[PDB]
């Protein structure tokens, strides 16, 4: 008529944040370099835009992670310009592309890292950047594809 | 898009092999994960080893990295050592994004003076002109977050065991101090006040 | 639009996906025996061997139950019930041949052997279940709306410039006040709320649930008889937060149809209220014509998340008898009214306190069976205490009939650090007193926990003292959870009584890949084949490690879900590496699903491969058909390979190399080796 | 009449290891984890039927069918409960009066079974989340 008790013992472990580049395979989309329009060192292309999100995960955990970008660096001068990755007929030249910010300001591609700042759209926490073309003196009309690394420390 | 199991992987004194889970979120995403272990100062070492390295992920997928102990013992048996583990999607006219998400792998010796719930209270301020340095005598990595000098967040600092860091303070914040320090799951304990001392 | 886009619930899984099992057979037993001493009458020896027999074969799951009885003196195999299951997946439903129970909420639950088709909630997304509110709208432009709870968001997605329909909304508990706040482009946001009140009966809207069952009248005593029978259920959600549901139940002497309505009406709760209305011929010749009205009211949260209210009345007519009254025998006092009045009230964030109230009248006997329950359970740290009171006044004469009790639970955490080491953590204690409201007291002081290093071994010793007679009843209980079977030893000591219990429960599968035993087996499982891969304990499941074959069964597995089987790597052999550590299966109503892992069990390698003293490039598969791997190269010509012979040669592929390798036996020995070969 | 099993009087049961992406938003959930409980020496004419009662602090009032978790020094999660599931797979009532379903009792040995599972209320916070419950039995 009578009975004991049960205890239930877990653990609830936190996940880190999934990242979601842009379009599928991590790939963003840019116009087609204009070999008239990328004449000069200061000539530029379209500012494509696009985002990261941070999906999957609590909206404190992805707010509190540091975020940077890396990759190539075509020149010592050219520290924001990403290395155009092809080796093929595609190949241009004195070309690349530029990761920019929210703003406008051109991202360091060593790889020193800045609060995240996620803005938090209905979906999940996201973070916008902005890629363009930066001609250095000279274009050719070739695919220049580039390459570059997203870093993210979850602190 | 891949995701790791935990944001911070404790690994304790005298086991070999520590697992930490990566999955694949997106149904349709062929991935390659490359792994391994930095120091504290982002230099690749074999200290950790990561197995598999590098291995492909086809689909929604579940796989577990086996972090192997290479310390030799060679390690400190006083204080906690940080680490960072990097784990690296490749994504196998556009320009790819390779992710690469960074954890703190805490080697913790297996004694330690001091267990790990009263690290965070045990955390004194030395305030100064321009400066809030943190003092935390307790054996551990503190994690201080949403330190609020009175009506301003100043940054998210990592204070390192038996150590001092420094942050920069502006001299229009109170005198009054609050903080919170992430605990070992990764969640948020509750905001306490901060001693002079 | 959104509503003419068939989008999927959440976490809906095509049934396509979903695993039949395999052609397997199954056996789960249950031995448990009990040695009484009395010092009056020596001592004795009990014996229950229960064996629970299976075939799952295609998707028909054939099962039997059968019992032996012992006694210290005959054998006496005794079959309880055997019934042929299946899930037909185009009617969403389940079927069911032989023996069987009736799950009917609108009738009484009803033991019968025959055919019974029945839908399945379990089948439908997790999404999809319960009672919650579909949201209709019209969004002009394409905009984002963000359902949200009272506390935080529920559905937030993107709409079309259209008609759209959300009906992924949660159960979120009884009640709740979802904001619905669409976000247009171009013109101000618009914000509705809707409240909602769920009850058991409610359905949610274009939901249908039926029951067809036919067959013989089973029951346990041997008075009533067995007469066919037919009962048809089905319960319908209507649009506007109503709810119909029908009922019908026919056999050779009792008829009856039961007819209901259940509403949601908001913020002032929930409503249902169904009439049956029965001809039932009697144990004697008599015919009788009745009708019974069951009411059920369900309020809304009070105050501010504080107090609940449920009445549920039952008015029955002279005249209405259940269809145990017409299966009585040949030749073998009606309800006139029942109340139940259930208020929950919390407090403090801690204390919960739960007042039920039973008061049923019948015809004629003016007595009344009153029940009063008062509970007051408290969390306060790892302290978890609860008292309790019980009042009961019922028609025969049980006087008051009043109990009190008293339950204190200490964890030893609370006073053990938090990184102790020792086996005291896991370990409680405590107490328990009860009163009769007579003088009869019944302390209980007891230590429990586990002390295996997988939480395995789970010990409970306990003392007590029942005084009116003074009897200080030590018991003390060791089970043990193990990868063959659970093993149970007790003993009971008292003033003049010393019980032994000890009991092995175990389950068997005969499946193709020869015999694998295990814990004893629960609905569905899931058989874990990793060959080569001896003694490697599961993940979150306790003391289920594979046998020296590899082959391990889990107890439980969740039915039409996404559950996630993983081997952990730390606890298995060196030698050992899997391909796979995790894997993903979706099991049927009771189904053996092969969770398949391949192990390598040469030893580890990493190798350095130079090609004409430069690094083999990123991207480059090493194979070795010498053992059958396979690798990637990470960088600077280092390749990972599991299950490696001691002296062999692999393949390179970039874009046709071979390197030849040799170790020596420390290395075989040493837990992950690294060689630097160069290739040809 | 009979009694719980020896050993089933106290129970732990290990739910393991969950994330707050299967336990995001309020109403997820995750797992079941199978418990059962045992009684000895039940007679079919002593008592044909039985059924159990849990009695266990809820998180919150709009949520009474599902526990509420005990802090820890350490840190208790947040949000989140333990709810115990039946054989037809219904929510019990943590009130102490609202019993579960009947059942056949078998001559001797009988195990009722139950699941445990995991219930979030809004956002997840990570922990250990630690429940108590106190069960009663009722014989008909």
Same mark, same amino acid.
């Given at each position: 008529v009578n009975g004991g008790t049960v205890h239930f013992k877990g653990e609830v472990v936190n996940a880190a944040c999934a990242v979601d580049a842009g379009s599928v395979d991590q790939t963003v989309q840019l116009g087609q370099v204009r070999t008239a329009? =990328?004449?000069?060192?200061?000539?530029?292309?379209?500012? $494509?835009? #696009?985002?990261?999100? =941070?999906?999957?995960?609590?909206?404190?955990?992805?707010?509190?992670?540091?975020?940077? #970008?890396?990759?190539?660096?075509?020149?010592?001068?050219?520290?924001? $310009?990403?290395?155009?990755?092809?080796?093929?007929?595609?190949?241009?030249?004195?070309?690349? $592309?530029?990761?920019?910010?929210?703003?406008?300001?051109?991202?360091?591609?060593?790889?020193?890292?800045?609060?995240?700042?996620?803005?938090?759209?209905?979906?999940?926490?996201?973070?916008? #950047?902005?890629?363009?073309? #930066?001609?250095?003196?000279?274009?050719?009309?070739?695919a220049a594809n580039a390459d570059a690394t997203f870093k993210v420390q979850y602190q | 898009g891949v995701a790791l199991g935990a944001t911070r992987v404790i690994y304790p004194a005298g086991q070999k092999q520590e697992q930490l889970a990566v999955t694949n979120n997106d149904e349709?995403?062929?991935?390659?994960? *490359?792994?391994?272990?930095?120091?504290?100062?982002?230099?690749?070492?074999?200290?950790?080893?990561?197995?598999?390295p590098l291995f492909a992920m086809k689909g929604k997928?579940?796989?577990?990295?086996?972090?192997?102990?290479?310390?030799?013992? *060679?390690?400190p048996q006083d204080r906690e050592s940080l680490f960072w583990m990097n784990v690296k999607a490749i994504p196998s006219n556009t320009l790819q994004l390779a992710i690469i998400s960074r954890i703190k792998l805490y080697?913790?010796?297996?004694?330690?003076?001091?267990?790990?719930? *009263?690290?965070?209270?045990?955390?004194?301020?030395?305030?100064?002109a321009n400066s809030l340095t943190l003092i935390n005598p307790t054996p551990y990595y503190l994690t201080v977050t949403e330190l609020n000098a009175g009506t301003r967040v100043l940054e998210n600092a990592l204070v390192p065991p038996m150590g001092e860091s420094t942050v920069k303070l502006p001299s229009d914040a109170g005198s009054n101090i609050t903080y919170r320090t992430i605990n070992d799951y990764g969640a948020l304990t509750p905001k306490m006040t901060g001693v002079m001392e | 639009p959104q509503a003419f886009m068939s989008n999927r619930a959440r976490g809906y899984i095509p049934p396509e996906l979903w695993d039949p099992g395999i052609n397997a057979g199954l056996l789960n037993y249950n031995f448990s025996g009990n040695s009484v001493q009395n010092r009056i009458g020596g001592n004795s020896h009990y014996a229950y061997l229960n064996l629970q027999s299976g075939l799952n074969i295609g998707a028909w799951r054939l099962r039997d139950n059968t019992t032996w009885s012992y006694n210290s003196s005959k054998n006496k195999w005794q079959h309880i019930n055997t019934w042929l299951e299946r899930d037909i997946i185009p009617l969403r439903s389940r079927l069911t041949l032989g023996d069987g129970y009736t799950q009917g909420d609108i009738f009484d639950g009803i033991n019968f052997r025959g055919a019974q088709l029945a839908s399945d909630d379990n089948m439908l997304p997790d999404s999809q279940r319960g009672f919650a509110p579909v949201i209709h709208g019209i969004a002009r432009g394409t905009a984002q709306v963000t359902i949200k709870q009272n506390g935080y968001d529920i559905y937030?997605?993107?709409?079309?410039?259209?008609?759209?329909?959300?009906? /992924?909304?949660?159960?979120?508990?009884?009640?709740? /006040? @979802?904001?619905?706040?669409?976000?247009?482009?171009?013109?101000?946001?618009?914000?509705?709320?809707?409240? +909602?009140?769920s009850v058991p009966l409610l359905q949610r809207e274009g939901h249908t649930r039926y029951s067809i069952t036919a067959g013989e009248y089973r029951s346990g005593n041997a008075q009533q008889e067995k007469p066919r029978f037919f009962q048809s259920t089905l319960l319908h959600g209507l649009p506007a937060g109503w709810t119909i549901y029908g009922g019908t139940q026919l056999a050779d002497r009792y008829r009856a149809f039961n007819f209901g309505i259940g509403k949601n009406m908001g913020a002032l709760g929930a409503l249902s209220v169904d009439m049956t209305q029965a001809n039932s011929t009697l144990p004697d010749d008599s015919q009788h014509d009745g009708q019974s009205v069951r009411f059920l009211y369900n309020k809304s949260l009070n105050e501010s998340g504080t107090n609940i209210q449920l009445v549920g009345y039952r008015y029955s007519t002279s005249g209405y008898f259940n269809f145990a009254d017409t299966t009585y025998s040949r030749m073998n006092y009606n309800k006139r009214g029942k109340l139940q009045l259930t208020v929950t009230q919390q407090l403090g964030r801690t204390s919960t306190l739960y007042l039920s109230g039973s008061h049923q009248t019948y015809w004629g006997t003016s007595n009344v069976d009153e029940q009063f329950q008062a509970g007051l359970n408290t969390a306060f740290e790892d302290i978890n205490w609860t008292l309790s009171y019980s009042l009961t006044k019922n028609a025969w004469q049980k006087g008051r009939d009043q109990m009190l009790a008293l339950n204190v639970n200490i964890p030893f955490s609370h006073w053990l650090r938090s990184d102790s080491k020792s086996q005291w953590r896991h370990a409680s204690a405590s107490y328990s007193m009860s009163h009769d409201l007579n003088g009869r007291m019944t302390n209980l002081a007891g230590v429990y926990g586990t002390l295996l290093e997988?939480?395995?071994?789970?010990?409970?010793?306990?003392?007590?003292?029942?005084?009116?007679?003074?009897?200080?009843?030590?018991? &003390?209980?060791?089970?043990?959870?193990?990868? +063959?079977?659970?093993?149970?030893?007790?003993?009971?000591?008292?003033?003049?009584?010393?019980?032994? +219990?000890?009991?092995?429960?175990?389950?068997?599968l005969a499946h193709a890949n020869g015999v694998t035993l295990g814990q004893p087996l629960n609905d569905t499982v899931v058989l874990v084949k990793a060959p080569?891969?001896? /003694?490697?304990?599961?993940?979150?499941?306790?003391?289920?490690?594979?046998?020296?074959?590899? +082959?391990?069964?889990?107890?439980?597995?969740?039915?039409?879900?996404?559950?996630?089987?993983?081997?952990?790597?730390?606890? @298995?052999?060196?030698?050992?590496?899997? /391909?796979?550590?995790?894997?993903?299966?979706?099991?049927?109503?009771? &189904?053996?699903?092969?969770?398949?892992?391949?192990?390598?069990?040469?030893?580890? @390698?990493?190798?350095?491969?130079?090609?004409?003293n430069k690094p083999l490039p990123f991207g480059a598969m090493v194979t070795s058909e010498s053992s059958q791997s396979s690798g990637i190269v990470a960088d600077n010509g280092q390749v990972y390979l599991s299950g490696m012979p001691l002296a062999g040669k692999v393949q390179v592929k970039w874009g046709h190399c071979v390197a030849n390798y040799q170790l020596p036996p420390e290395s075989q020995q040493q837990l992950l080796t690294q060689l630097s070969a160069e290739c040809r």
């Open positions: 329009s =990328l004449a000069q060192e200061g000539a530029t292309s379209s500012a $494509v835009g #696009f985002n990261i999100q =941070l999906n999957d995960c609590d909206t404190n955990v992805a707010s509190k992670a540091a975020v940077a #970008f890396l990759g190539t660096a075509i020149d010592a001068g050219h520290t924001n $310009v990403l290395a155009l990755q092809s080796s093929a007929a595609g190949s241009a030249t004195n070309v690349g $592309v530029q990761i920019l910010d929210r703003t406008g300001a051109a991202l360091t591609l060593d790889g020193a890292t800045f609060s995240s700042e996620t803005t938090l759209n209905n979906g999940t926490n996201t973070i916008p #950047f902005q890629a363009r073309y #930066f001609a250095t003196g000279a274009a050719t009309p070739g | 349709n995403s062929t991935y390659l994960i *490359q792994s391994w272990v930095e120091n504290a100062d982002g230099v690749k070492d074999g200290r950790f080893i990561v197995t598999p997928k579940e796989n577990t990295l086996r972090i192997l102990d290479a310390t030799n013992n *060679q390690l080697y913790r010796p297996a004694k330690l003076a001091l267990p790990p719930d *009263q690290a965070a209270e045990k955390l004194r301020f030395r305030r100064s | 937030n997605s993107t709409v079309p410039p259209g008609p759209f329909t959300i009906n /992924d909304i949660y159960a979120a508990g009884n009640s709740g /006040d @979802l904001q619905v706040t669409i976000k247009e482009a171009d013109g101000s946001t618009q914000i509705f709320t809707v409240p +909602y009140s997988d939480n395995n071994l789970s010990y409970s010793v306990q003392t007590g003292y029942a005084g009116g007679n003074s009897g200080s009843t030590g018991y &003390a209980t060791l089970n043990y959870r193990g990868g +063959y079977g659970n093993a149970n030893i007790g003993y009971s000591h008292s003033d003049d009584i010393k019980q032994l +219990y000890y009991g092995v429960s175990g389950g068997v080569g891969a001896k /003694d490697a304990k599961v993940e979150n499941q306790t003391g289920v490690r594979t046998d020296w074959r590899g +082959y391990a069964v889990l107890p439980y597995a969740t039915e039409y879900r996404e559950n996630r089987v993983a081997l952990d790597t730390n606890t @298995l052999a060196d030698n050992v590496d899997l /391909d796979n550590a995790v894997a993903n299966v979706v099991p049927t109503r009771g &189904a053996i699903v092969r969770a398949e892992f391949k192990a390598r069990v040469g030893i580890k @390698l990493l190798m350095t491969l130079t090609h004409n």
